[PDB]
Design a protein around this ligand. Structure first.
Ligand code: ATP
Ligand code: ATP
Ligand code: MG
Ligand code: MG
Lengths: 8, 51, 343, 343
């Protein structure tokens, strides 16, 4: 499963 | 002599070192210091404020 | 959603490029580093230095920018009432054009960047030759020798009390002559920081590792942080690289999203796991695509804008010589225990 | 009771953080060193300098603060009959930016800190170029030649006649050019102490040990005072470390009691027995816990804000060198006896 990060 | 006194006072108030040349440069007749009392007054003011 | 808004599909190339450039991602490495730096900033507890080591292009400067931005909202509500205070200040060291470092220029630049809050505020530095002209630019005479500038900077730093003094590109402090020692330069910096009571955060490449553990004082006096890259030798770093590639792919303002997950290997070849290098490569290739008017991204445009072989060779050599000195092993812990006698 | 007051539980976190910050424990080594330093300051018996060695974070600066406030408090009741005298002056030297240690800047800093309180009067050092200002701070011109500044400081020190000249971070006196023996550097202050009658108490780390015995004339008027950590070889020092750990833990503003007593070894290796390091580490952990509202302090919360093993090894090497330098055995007494001829 590939995770999706948020904006810093 | 008074005018020299306020000149050195204001010059030190702004922050510059009040020297003979700087005081002369902002006084209309910068040759009066040949008088044996005007230079004495300037030196006395400098000593009073600590030079 | 999880990517760029669809409205950006009707704009010019400049808007897409600006949106992508003003887009910063939060990988777990950056998240942990940001959290511990924020916690250290909150309460240094007698720490004079926070050295920030990391590979060139890992994200040091963006982390510093976000830190100052955060410091500016943790202060603004408390800056509505209080005044004569700045949240955070920064400066970048000047590489000297002579054989030796110019400390006088450092002091002058620090005084220039520190003291410009508002024309209304006035304060006497006690040094003859420092004033503010009619244009509101702090001017320093050419004859003010280094100790006088140091005293003026000390007074200004005490008056202003920033939460931290950021010194980026700190390795330039090492440009010294034969007899000059690095401990002397770091001791001058430590004396400044301790006398003004302002925490100093030095950021730079692994060359700044020459300023680490010099003396016992400079040593205790220090919280060393490390902005490590992602390494292919661990599954977690590889997976995080793939995930950041996926989120970049979904945040590339194009009608068709390119598949950058499968091309991670070559990616890691030219980026060394550094997210900043990856971002600059991606933004370059996006500018290329939007100039050529290409809907998606292909490998040829990736190879037309990647770094050279020798550049990556030297980068990885420096990175290896850096990480070799910033690793903790149980053998060192037991060695210290035995030397102290705790074992 | 013997711990933190319960009413601090409803207080804001800033109050608890500050309260632990200014909280002090009179651990036995600090007590003994304060006693000997006070007794040596009270009368100098011709002594020109007192060397107070120690590691980084031992508590030299807290020592100086306590001693200075004490001398001020004793001098306050008697400062009405005899004015024109300062009880104690406290300075810390500047690490030079040039190769040479700037003597003129040392003299300038000393005269300001000496004469900078009220306008009780004046002294008129009789040296031109030195004065105060409308803001009340003494300002001297860059044209005042260093012998003139020395004479002005001489007259000011003979008037003020302070009990002691505090000089923290005195190891910075060693930063001298090549071919210039540290002897003459110490004799520069020796002449000042001899023709002003003021004893100069120099603190600092073990790097000051290069100033110990240069000439017999220097060593005769000197008092050696050594701040030492808690060595792990004897169990009395281990019990002292345990007891101060209890004292520190007892006044931690925590809802539940963090049993830090069990892991005394981990505290020891990350602190090296220098109580300042433990104070800073516990303060960092307290700040993090108050941010996270933690009911107790656990092991991970202790190991995030702990010193790196490399810094610990470097400072420990410095400590071992210093303890080797400041070691006296009966054998040395026997050698002195045999050399004199008393045998
Ligand atoms: N997490 C990130 N998300 C998006 N862009 C990033 C991120 N980190 C870095 N960048 C981008 O990478 C580029 C260069 O990185 P950065 O300025 O942070 O360099 P640095 O790590 O401080 O390195 P150097 O020591 O070489 O100056 C910038 O365009 C910056 O916006
Ligand atoms: N008895 C004590 N109780 C509590 N905290 C203490 C005590 N002694 C020292 N400390 C802590 O140690 C910290 C650092 O100690 P101090 O500044 O005296 O070190 P130093 O040995 O003079 O350092 P340096 O060698 O780096 O100049 C203080 O800020 C204080 O928090
Ligand atoms: Mg940079
Ligand atoms: Mg100190």
């Amino acid at each position: 499963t590939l995770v999706v990060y948020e904006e810093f | 002599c008074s005018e020299v006194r306020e000149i050195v006072l204001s010059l030190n108030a702004q922050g510059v070192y009040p020297t003979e040349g700087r005081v002369c440069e902002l006084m209309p007749n910068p040759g009066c210091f040949r008088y044996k009392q005007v230079r004495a007054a300037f030196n006395d003011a400098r000593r009073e404020f600590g030079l | 959603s999880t990517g760029f808004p669809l409205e950006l599909l009707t704009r010019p190339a400049t808007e897409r490029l600006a949106y992508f450039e003003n887009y910063t991602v939060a990988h777990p490495r950056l998240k942990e580093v940001y959290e511990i730096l924020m916690r250290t900033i909150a309460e240094p507890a007698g720490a004079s230095f926070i050295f920030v080591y990391g590979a060139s292009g890992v994200g040091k400067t963006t982390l510093r920018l976000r830190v100052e931005q955060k410091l500016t909202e943790l202060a603004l509500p408390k800056l509505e009432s209080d005044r004569a205070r700045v949240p955070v200040v920064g400066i970048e060291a000047i590489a000297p054009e002579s054989r030796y470092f110019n400390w006088k220029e450092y002091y002058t630049r620090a005084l220039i960047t520190l003291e410009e809050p508002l024309i209304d505020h006035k304060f006497d530095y006690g040094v003859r030759g420092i004033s503010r002209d009619n244009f509101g630019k702090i001017n320093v005479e050419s004859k003010v020798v280094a100790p006088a500038l140091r005293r003026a900077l000390e007074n200004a730093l005490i008056h202003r009390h920033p939460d931290v003094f950021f010194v980026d590109e700190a390795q330039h402090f090492g440009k010294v002559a034969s007899g000059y020692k690095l401990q002397d330069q770091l001791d001058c910096l430590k004396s400044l920081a301790n006398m003004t009571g302002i925490l100093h955060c030095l950021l730079g490449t692994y060359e700044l590792l020459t300023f680490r553990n010099l003396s016992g004082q400079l040593s205790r006096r220090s919280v060393d942080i490390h902005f490590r890259r992602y390494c292919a030798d661990s599954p977690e770093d590889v997976q995080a690289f793939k995930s950041v590639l996926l989120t970049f792919q979904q945040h590339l303002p194009l009608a068709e999203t390119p598949n950058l997950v499968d091309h991670w290997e070559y990616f890691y070849e030219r980026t060394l796991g550094c997210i900043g290098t990856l971002k600059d490569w991606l933004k370059r290739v996006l500018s290329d695509a939007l100039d050529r008017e290409a809907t998606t991204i292909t490998l040829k445009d990736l190879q037309k804008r990647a770094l050279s072989v020798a550049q990556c060779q030297k980068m990885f050599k420096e990175i290896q010589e850096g990480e070799r000195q910033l690793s903790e092993t149980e053998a060192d812990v037991q060695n210290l225990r035995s030397a102290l006698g705790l074992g």
